[PDB]
Amino acid sequence: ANKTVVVTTILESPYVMMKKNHEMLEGNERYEGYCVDLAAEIAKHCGFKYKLTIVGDGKYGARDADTKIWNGMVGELVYGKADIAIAPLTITLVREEVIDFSKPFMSLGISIMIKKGTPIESAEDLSKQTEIAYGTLDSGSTKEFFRRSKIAVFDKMWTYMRSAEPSVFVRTTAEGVARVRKSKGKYAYLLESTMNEYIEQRKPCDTMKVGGNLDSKGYGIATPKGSSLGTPVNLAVLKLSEQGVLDKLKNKWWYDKGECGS
Numbered sequence: 001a002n003k004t005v006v007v008t009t010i011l012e013s014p015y016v017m018m019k020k021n022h023e024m025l026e027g028n029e030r031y032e033g034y035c036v037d038l039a040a041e042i043a044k045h046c047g048f049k050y051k052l053t054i055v056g057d058g059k060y061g062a063r064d065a066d067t068k069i070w071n072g073m074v075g076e077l078v079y080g081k082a083d084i085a086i087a088p089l090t091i092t093l094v095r096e097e098v099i100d101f102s103k104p105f106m107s108l109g110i111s112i113m114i115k116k117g118t119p120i121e122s123a124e125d126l127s128k129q130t131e132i133a134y135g136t137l138d139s140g141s142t143k144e145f146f147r148r149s150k151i152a153v154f155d156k157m158w159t160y161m162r163s164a165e166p167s168v169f170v171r172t173t174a175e176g177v178a179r180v181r182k183s184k185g186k187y188a189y190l191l192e193s194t195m196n197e198y199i200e201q202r203k204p205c206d207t208m209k210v211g212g213n214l215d216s217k218g219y220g221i222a223t224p225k226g227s228s229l230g231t232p233v234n235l236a237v238l239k240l241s242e243q244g245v246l247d248k249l250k251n252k253w254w255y256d257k258g259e260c261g262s
């Protein structure tokens with residue numbers, strides 16, 4: 001018999017956010033955002049009931065080098081705590097080896113966020129100077145991109161970041177944004193272009209995305225390897241793309257109510 005599908009996701013704006021009046025509500029109704037809407041669409045097109053859960057450790061998913069244990073949403077799938085992850089979870093090789101990903105539902109690349117007026121236009125710019133500190137989320141695909149890169153500029157950036165004092169790494173996107181906003185132009189934040197573009201249209205309208213993206217990739221909906229949900233979820237993502245629903249939802253959560261003018 002069909003069983004309610006446990007969805008793991010993460011509190012990351014504008015993907016999943018607690019409604020202001022969440023206390024009046026319960027279950028799935030507590031949350032709103034792009035991935036809440038996407039989860040509803042996927043569930044509708046696959047014919048399942050579901051429960052949204054926020055990942056216990058608040059992480060995306062990395063494997064500990066020593067214990068080989070996966071954390072975050074990836075871990076929740078790997079160890080059978082959740083049936084599906086619907087979140088801004090980047091499709092990566094190391095993850096694909098242990099979980100399944102749908103075709104991507106959103107495109108993104110690593111990007112640079114500055115406080116307005118910061119004299120930085122590119123990654124190369126960052127790499128050639130020391131006055132302005134810069135960093136990434138302390139866990140996830142952005143950090144891994146730099147750790148692994150063999151590209152000269154990116155290698156130079158990683159070599160700087162890994163031993164920077166005090167630390168240039170942050171625990172959450174909100175922390176990186178706060179650091180950019182409060183550091184008077186002396187900190188730049190490396191983050192996914194999707195988050196960057198969202199923040200750029202939020203008050204107090206003091207940040208800017210600069211330069212091209214450093215890579216090009218996508219977020220995918222993840223299931224445990226061999227799960228019966230993999231196929232219908234993938235077909236649903238294809239259908240939603242083709243029917244324009246993904247574009248509509250991106251506009252809804254990024255731009256339709258942007259706070260920094262037109």
Ligand SMILES: CC(C)S(=O)(=O)NC[C@H](C)c1ccc(-c2ccc([C@@H](C)CNS(=O)(=O)C(C)C)cc2)cc1
Nearest residue numbers: 091092103104105106107108216217218237238241
């Ligand atoms: C991890 C990488 C291999 S990757 O991210 O999967 N691809 C890399 C390559 C540069 C790239 C990167 C991003 C995209 C891309 C294109 C479209 C989308 C959405 C809007 C639709 N995805 S879809 O599969 O084409 C669709 C028919 C449902 C999402 C991602 C396509 C290709």
Ligand SMILES: N[C@@H](Cn1cc(F)c(=O)[nH]c1=O)C(=O)O
Nearest residue numbers: 060088089090140141142191192
């Ligand atoms: N999507 C990433 C997590 N993640 C999120 C961000 F907002 C970011 O800037 N960098 C990053 O790695 C992942 O799946 O690891």
